[PDB]
Amino acid sequence: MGIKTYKPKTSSLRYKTTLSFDDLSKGNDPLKSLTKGKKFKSGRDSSGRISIRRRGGGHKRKYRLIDFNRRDKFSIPARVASIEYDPNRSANIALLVYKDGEKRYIISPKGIKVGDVLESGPNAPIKIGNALPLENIPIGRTVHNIELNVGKGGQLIRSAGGYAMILASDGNYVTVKLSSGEMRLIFKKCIATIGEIGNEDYANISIGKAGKSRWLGRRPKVRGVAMNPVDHPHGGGEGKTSGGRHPVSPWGQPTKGYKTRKKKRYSDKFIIKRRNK
Amino acid sequence: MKAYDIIVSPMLTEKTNTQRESINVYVFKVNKRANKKEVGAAIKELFNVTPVSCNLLNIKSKAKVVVSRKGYPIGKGKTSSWKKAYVYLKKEDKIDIF
Amino acid sequence: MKRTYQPSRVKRNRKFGFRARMKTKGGRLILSRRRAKGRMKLTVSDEKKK
RNA sequence: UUUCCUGGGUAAAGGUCGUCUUCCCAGGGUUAGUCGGCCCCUAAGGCAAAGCUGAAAAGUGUAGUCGAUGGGAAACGGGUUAAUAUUCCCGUACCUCUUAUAGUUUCGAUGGAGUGACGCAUGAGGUUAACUACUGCUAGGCGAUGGUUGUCCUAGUUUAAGCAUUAAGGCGAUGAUCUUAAUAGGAAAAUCCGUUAAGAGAGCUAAGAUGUGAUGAUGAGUGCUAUUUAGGUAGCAUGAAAUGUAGGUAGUCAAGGUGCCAAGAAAUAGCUUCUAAGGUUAGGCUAUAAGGGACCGUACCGCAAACCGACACAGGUAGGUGGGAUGAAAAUUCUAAGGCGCGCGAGAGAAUCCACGUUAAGGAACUCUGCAAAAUACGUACGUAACUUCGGGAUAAGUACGACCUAAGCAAUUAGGUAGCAUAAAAAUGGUCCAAACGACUGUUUACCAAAAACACAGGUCUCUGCAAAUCUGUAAAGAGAAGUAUA
RNA sequence: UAAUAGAGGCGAUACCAGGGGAAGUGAACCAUCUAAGUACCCUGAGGAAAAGAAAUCAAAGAGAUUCCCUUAGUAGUGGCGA
């Protein structure tokens, strides 16, 4: 992968770095039969209010129909056609062309190249890119795109540069260390993809200026001490207060250390040891 | 609507007179519910001649200001709108009733 | 100075038209009230503007 | 929304007057298969049987249906009226269908597929209306005052859609159309599967140019008649005078080429194509002649006394045209076409009020403060520091040249000569330097006394969140988060 | 789907039944209380609606419901305050 830096010809370029797209089959337009135009979200809901703040108008982008659920294509080999840039997620997307003529997108793992043959199912070889139920993957491998309920698709780790570590297997369950670091039990019949996700320099980037942050669809963040007490519990800044109060969210919920996970959730059985600060 | 509820009355105006004299065009007041086809059919039935084409216009209502018995504006009255038809005949054809 | 009444027409008819009034409960109450008072103009659709 | 045109009128309205008017009264005026709609399509979004949730009203929400500021069959030039014209007329075309004929041969969905289908920046190049430079051809003049029958003066020298010919360039030979053989999609297919074996295959797109359109129209003018303010203006007739060279812009080729990351609408429409239930003149296709164009808008104002501001208001109002000279330029000044001379005037110039011009000597002594003015200003060369994140600072600072004629020179400039107080002679067009405080910076903010040291910002840390995630709106369902997944 | 029958909306800025249900105020503050089941909203009807032929009253022996007169500003109730 790589990082491309810029000479400081303006005061904004001094700390701008972007990725280098050398590990990408470039010059590419998405497959017309898999992408549809879409709005930009900006965080408003059906009622029309703002439910999530500070999300705004970035660059217009199309949506690429990914496939995290390769189950209905077991035993059928496919060919890697190209590795493409996806604006809707960090990771890159590989275009698989199946032997029966159907084409699909997947998350591009780390180290695959055009022309590779990929296979899914219990019988598939243990090779980067293959999707197999957790039964069949040997202890000690690194997988990604983990399915949580049979038939749902990959709902666990998916972002650029991530991977999960298989630790142990027992009964109906497999112990998996997730990228946040907790150890969680997974039902042994769900599928997963072998190998890490490529594009691991995605977060080594220094954005460089407020404009690019606006391109990424992120409106400005207004602190709480810049508010008035009607606006935010921290307001009242007659000469730079610090809130005069233990830190809280704009709705009074404590924020420095308060644990917001429900105390009696349904999945508590399947969490061995939570993540670490 | 019979061909008699279609054609209301002709128009005798300077413009229509010169047009009729020069390019053989006849102008009628027709009913607001007519259209090109039954205006042509009505012309045929009434004057036994088939028109090459017909053009229709919608003339809007002219507004007037109404003043009291003493006289000062108290509202806006209006004339009735109507529909005007230009009818084009063949150079040998004529309509005699005029 | 650009000011308070930039006069559109699609906005006028869509927001304040007769169908927009009938479309909900409060609009029908508006119509009943104006009928009772005997207004000469019930909605902005009496101004023939499309 | 009649304010448009014609005729008539001056209660009122017009900041005066009025025979006048956008004011009043009467009549007249808006003609479409090609323009804009309607219609067939979808985006944002609205509504919504079912389902789900709520004392009620209703709230969510799938199949569906609406919703342009977008995508979709088709026309241009000239003339005419007191007012309408890509609508009427003249001239010449185009697109859709209904019936019928003659050659026919696979047609038929609200279903499938292809196309439709798109970003920013940036050259360079091909052609070109407008526009001036010249030659010529035509029409008028030869000028109250020195010189002007010449290398004179002024003006015109125009003309579309469509059609036929060919084709600058670009994309193309790593494959664009096609020909089989196999077939794990969802109706099942001879299409798409573009997936895979061959191997036959280079054409496609395209501004523009010529001819036709066009012996037509237009036409500076010229000729009869009336009229006249003695100047032209009203009609009627007539009138190739280059479809010349060279330069050349804004468009267009171009949704091009080449780079870059922030990775750049949808469509069930249109176009093309595939078939099921079905059809085998039942059609579909290629022509050919016959005729069918729906319904609505069309006047007038539209940088303004007709829209929005209570007004005949120093304000605002999208887009396309944007002549000539100067110039890098849409800057500045002047000016052609065209449109106007702001809907109270006329005398007098006292003080004074507001806005400007110039000034002896001194040059901030004024004042809270160099506030305001003055000054600097352009092009081409010379020469540029401390400091620095090595990019800057920097147009640093400072200074020279600039007109006219002749000669050199591709130009920029060089030399000589001439003239003035002044030669970037008008207007437009940086004042600079040193030091300190705050904020890094470009930006944002109290519409209507605060534009800043405030907010935002890239960057940093802490902490929460394992996905029917945290969080938020609601009594809920539900939605956002997210068609995302701790590099979030 | 078919067959019929009945509903939809308006009126009456009135009356009636049911559901939801305030506050300006008074208590010389105010929170219980008051205003008040009033204003308003919503769903239903009618010519009236509602109620109605005792598993009732209440210490008299009466005999469905409803509306007037009295009991009576009494019995009670109330930060026993208003």
DSSP bridge partners of B82 = B59
DSSP bridge partners of B84 = B29, B57
Q: Distance from CA of residue A42 to its chain's centroid?
A: 19
CA dist., res. A70 & res. A52, Å (int): 32
Q: Is the dihedral of CA A102, A104, A109, A112 positive or negative?
A: positive
CA A97 to C1' D181, in angstroms, rounded, equals 21
Q: How does strand A164-170 pair with strand B25-30?
A: unpaired
Amino acid making up residue A14:
R
DSSP bridge partners of A95 = A82, A105
Nucleotide nearest A145, from its CA to each C1': D485
Burial classification of residue A8, based on how many CB atoms lie within 10 Å of its CB (0-12 exposed, 13-18 middle, 19 or more buried): exposed
CA A55 to C1' D200, in angstroms, rounded, equals 58
- Determine whether the distance from the CB of A239 to the nearest atom of strand D is below 7 Å: no
DSSP bridge partners of B63 = B78
- Determine whether the distance from the CB of C35 to the nearest atom of strand E is below 7 Å: yes
The two structure tokens encoding residue A261:
């996970």
**Secondary structure (3-state) at A84:** strand
Q: Which of A219, A177, A233 is nearest to A52 (CA)?
A: A219
Distance spanning both ends of chain C, measured CA to CA: 28
- Determine whether the distance from the CB of A46 to the nearest atom of strand D is below 7 Å: yes
- Determine whether the distance from the CB of A17 to the nearest atom of strand D is below 7 Å: no
- Determine whether the distance from the CB of B74 to the nearest atom of strand D is below 7 Å: no
Nucleotide nearest B22, from its CA to each C1': D89
- Determine whether the distance from the CB of A38 to the nearest atom of strand D is below 7 Å: yes
Output DSSP code: residue A18.
E
Going by C-beta distance under 8 Å and a sequence separation of 6 or more, which residues neighbour residue A215? A58, A59
Cite the DSSP H helix spans in C1-50: 10-16, 18-22, 25-37
Q: What is the resolution of this structure in A?
A: 2.9
Output DSSP code: residue A13.
G
- Determine whether the distance from the CB of C23 to the nearest atom of strand E is below 7 Å: no
- Determine whether the distance from the CB of C40 to the nearest atom of strand E is below 7 Å: no
CA dist., res. A163 & res. A46, Å (int): 35
The two structure tokens encoding residue A92:
């890159």
Nucleotide nearest C36, from its CA to each C1': E13
Q: Which of B62, B67, B43 is nearest to B54 (CA)?
A: B43
**Contacting partners of chain C (3+ CB pairs under 8 A):** none
CA A34 to C1' D329, in angstroms, rounded, equals 49
**Contacting partners of chain B (3+ CB pairs under 8 A):** none
Contact criterion met (CB below 8 Å) for A144 and A197:
yes
CA A60 to C1' E74, in angstroms, rounded, equals 84
Q: Which of A139, A161, A157 is nearest to A147 (CA)?
A: A157
CA B45 to C1' D27, in angstroms, rounded, equals 32
Residue B22: which H helix or E strand, with range?
A: helix B14-23
- Determine whether the distance from the CB of C28 to the nearest atom of strand E is below 7 Å: yes
- Determine whether the distance from the CB of C32 to the nearest atom of strand E is below 7 Å: yes
Question: Which residues 94 to 133 of A reach strand D, CB within 7 A?
Answer: 97-103
Nucleotide nearest A90, from its CA to each C1': D487
- Determine whether the distance from the CB of C24 to the nearest atom of strand E is below 7 Å: no
Contact criterion met (CB below 8 Å) for A141 and A178:
no
Nucleotides of E under 7 A from a protein CB: 9-13, 42-43
CA dist., res. A98 & res. A175, Å (int): 32
CA A75 to C1' D196, in angstroms, rounded, equals 19
Nucleotide nearest A154, from its CA to each C1': D485
CA A231 to C1' E28, in angstroms, rounded, equals 38
Nucleotides of D under 7 A from a protein CB: 1-2, 24-26, 28-33, 43-46, 57-61, 68, 81-83, 88-89, 113-118, 183-185, 193-196, 261-267, 293-298, 307-309, 315-317, 389-391, 440-442, 454-459, 462-473, 478-488
CA dist., res. A68 & res. A91, Å (int): 13
CB-CB neighbours of B1 under 10 Å: 10
Going by C-beta distance under 8 Å and a sequence separation of 6 or more, which residues neighbour residue C47? C41
